[PDB]
Design a protein around this ligand. Structure first.
Ligand SMILES: *P(=O)(O)OC[C@H]1O[C@@H](n2cnc3c(N)ncnc32)[C@H](O)[C@@H]1O
Length: 351
């Protein structure tokens, strides 16, 4: 059952969005008074006329970084890592002098001094990855500039799980996915779930994301609209979580570590004070101001993350103090401002 208020606002906003953006398939969850309401449109596979369902898997792209941030928070809560730890503590083979003074905090929050947006495609092995980072030259001193980048938080994720004894995949499954009952969320889609894996569409072609080094950490997660609704609810209400270090980790990922303009950098998540200027949630390196100690999570925030792959576009946003949130998953990568304006209209209407 849907409250009519929710059906009305979703139809008024998402139907025109799909009409304008030519999105083949889409799933939306609205979290309202903490409870989820689901909507699906169109096709997961156009050539077979296979409909989007609540079990359809979508590529999350950089929304994956929120899982990584929370897993990192959980490691912090366990005392397995500190954000002030040097990167070299967890990877002593990283001997180049430019790595002196670079911390896990820098890696997690894109402030190491200009690590590249992309890990080079030909990097395959551990020795390849080492050689990549060993020859990187910073454009800036650490902790001065934010350059949003996969190679930064991707390495954070890989290093953060070293004290656990587990692989990144094993740590994520056991410490985050399983406690939160995300049973249809995958770093690697298993064979019996391939029937539910949507195709993305780019320039008229059915596509899936390409494998790359540190993809699991930076952009590789696939999930359903139901699990993503569960993810939003968990990040809005950590107090309801039995796993103590996960509860803490979720809170730590919404701590405010850096400020640029009216945006605050968390771990994976990005935050702004609510109410927001829409200009700010719609919008190169930017200077950052450190926040020390980091501000504990502010419930009166717009918390959000966008993600894209070649064939998919994702958006998650929520306002903890209002128990209000939205997940938008689509198998076309369409412009961020269209996504965000629609989300902003919907969440404003449900206050
Ligand atoms: P977020 O969705 O902001 O970014 C992650 C997406 O960026 C693309 N990406 C990461 N790494 C590469 C490489 N090496 N080459 C081409 N594209 C890359 C993917 O679309 C990620 O999903």
């Amino acid at each position: 059952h849907h409250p009519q208020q929710i059906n009305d606002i979703v139809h008024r906003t998402i139907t025109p969005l799909i009409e304008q953006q030519k999105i083949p398939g889409m799933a939306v969850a609205v979290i309202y008074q903490g409870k989820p309401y689901y909507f699906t449109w169109g096709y997961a596979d156009i050539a077979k006329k296979q409909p989007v369902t609540q079990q359809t898997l979508f590529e999350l792209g950089s929304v994956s970084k929120t899982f990584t941030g929370v897993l990192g928070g959980d490691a912090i809560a366990r005392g397995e890592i500190k954000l002030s730890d040097p990167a070299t503590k967890y990877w002593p083979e990283l001997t180049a002098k430019q790595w002196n003074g670079i911390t896990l905090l820098h890696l997690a929050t894109y402030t190491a001094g200009g690590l590249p947006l992309q890990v080079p495609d030909e990097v395959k092995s551990s020795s390849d990855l080492l050689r990549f980072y060993q020859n990187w030259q910073p454009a800036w001193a650490p902790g001065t500039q934010r350059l949003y980048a996969n190679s930064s938080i991707g390495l954070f994720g890989a290093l953060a799980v070293k004290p656990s004894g587990l692989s990144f995949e094993q740590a994520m499954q056991t410490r985050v996915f399983q406690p939160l009952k995300l049973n249809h969320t995958w770093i690697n889609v298993p064979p019996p779930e391939e029937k539910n894996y949507a195709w993305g569409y780019r320039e008229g072609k059915a596509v899936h994301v390409s494998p790359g080094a540190l993809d699991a950490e930076a952009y590789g997660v696939k999930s359903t609209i139901e699990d993503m609704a569960r993810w939003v609810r968990s990040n809005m209400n950590p107090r309801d979580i039995n796993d103590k270090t996960l509860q803490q980790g979720i809170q730590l990922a919404q701590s405010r570590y850096w400020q640029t303009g009216d945006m605050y950098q968390g771990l994976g998540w990005e935050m702004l004070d609510w109410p927001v200027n829409p200009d700010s949630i719609i919008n190169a390196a930017h200077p950052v101001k450190a926040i020390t100690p980091p501000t504990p999570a502010v419930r009166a925030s717009w918390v959000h993350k966008t993600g894209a792959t070649g064939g998919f576009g994702s958006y998650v946003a929520f306002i903890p103090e209002k128990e209000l949130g939205i997940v938008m998953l689509a198998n076309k990568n369409y412009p961020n401002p269209a996504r965000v304006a629609a989300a902003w209209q919907i969440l404003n209407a449900l206050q």
